[PDB]
Amino acid sequence: QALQLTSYTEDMRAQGLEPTSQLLDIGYITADDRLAGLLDITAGGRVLRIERLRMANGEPMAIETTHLSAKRFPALRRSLVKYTSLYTALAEVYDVHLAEAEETIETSLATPREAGLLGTDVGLPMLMLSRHSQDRTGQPVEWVRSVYRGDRYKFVARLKRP
Amino acid sequence: QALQLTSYTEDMRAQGLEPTSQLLDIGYITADDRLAGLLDITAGGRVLRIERLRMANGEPMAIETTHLSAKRFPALRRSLVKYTSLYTALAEVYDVHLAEAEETIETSLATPREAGLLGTDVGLPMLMLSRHSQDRTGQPVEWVRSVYRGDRYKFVARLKRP
């Protein structure tokens, strides 16, 4: 609670590595109840889904899948090409800024496709990150699910106790 | 950065589960340079090592191995039986209180012994937590290494961005 909401780029530089990305896929899907609840939209609502391959020192590091309300951000898909960053896009196009988020850390095995994209096998433990962010108006902005190579990644938290 | 320094008990209750423990082993070891640096003691220095089996809902959940300066806490081993908690012991016997800590999250496979103690196999992804704590006088107090069952555990962080 009350930790530092750091995006992918900073968490890599705060770890020595040089971050880069590659869009794998982008498109609209239909929200089931679970996703609808997380984005505060109605079930059946349209969701923009972005899938990116994250790299560091040139090699595959993570697959990052971001979900957002298409209804709220109907021109975001088109605008994303203009930008280096989803969050730049949200700030400049929609004046939306992340304020707070709940991050979940788990470990799991990769799917066959994931293993292929990350140059690992399906027996390597992977770090699974989920992130549920809200904006400065206290609305949910995104639900993010990422799979990190377990041999190459660690996540560091600085904790304090009052 | 600036997250909430939560001990094992709170992190379980903030997750629905009912926490219990069992001492597996306790004793002194000699610090190698790496450990000596973390506890701010001289290489060769004596370290109190505590190994505990953590349980929740009755079943095995984590193995938690804590290291402390024996020189600084020479009567801690003996005093630990009187107490429900290492941190109660440190507060009451030595007036030492955790103030800040660096926590590392990783995933790895269990050793054969670990797998046996946790009723899992060595193919299950495990969550590896390291914790390096300092006290209210800004000195290092502990270095902790824990292995959590990957099928049963998640770690939740609440992040903010100024």
Author numbering:
A (entry chain A), B (entry chain A): 91 to 252
Wording from the paper:
The DNA-binding sites for DasR are cis-regulatory elements with a length of 16 base pairs and are termed DasR-responsive elements (dre-sites). Gene repression by DasR is abrogated by several effectors such as, for example, GlcN-6-P. In addition to the regulation of the N-acetylglucosamine-related catabolic genes, DasR also participates in global processes like cell development and secondary metabolite biosynthesis. Members of this family share a common N-terminal winged-helix-turn-helix (wHTH) DNA-binding domain (DBD), but display different C-terminal effector-binding and oligomerisation domains (EBD).
While full-length DasR encompasses a homodimer in the asymmetric unit, DasR-EBD crystallised with only one monomer in the asymmetric unit and forms a homodimer with a crystallographically related neighbouring monomer. The conformation of this segment resembles that observed in full-length NagR in complex with DNA. The effector-binding pocket extends across both monomers in ligand-free DasR-EBD and encompasses a total solvent-accessible volume of about 440 Å3 (220 Å3 per monomer). At the same time numerous segments of the EBDs, which most frequently comprise helix αE1 and adjacent segments, can often not be modelled in these structures.
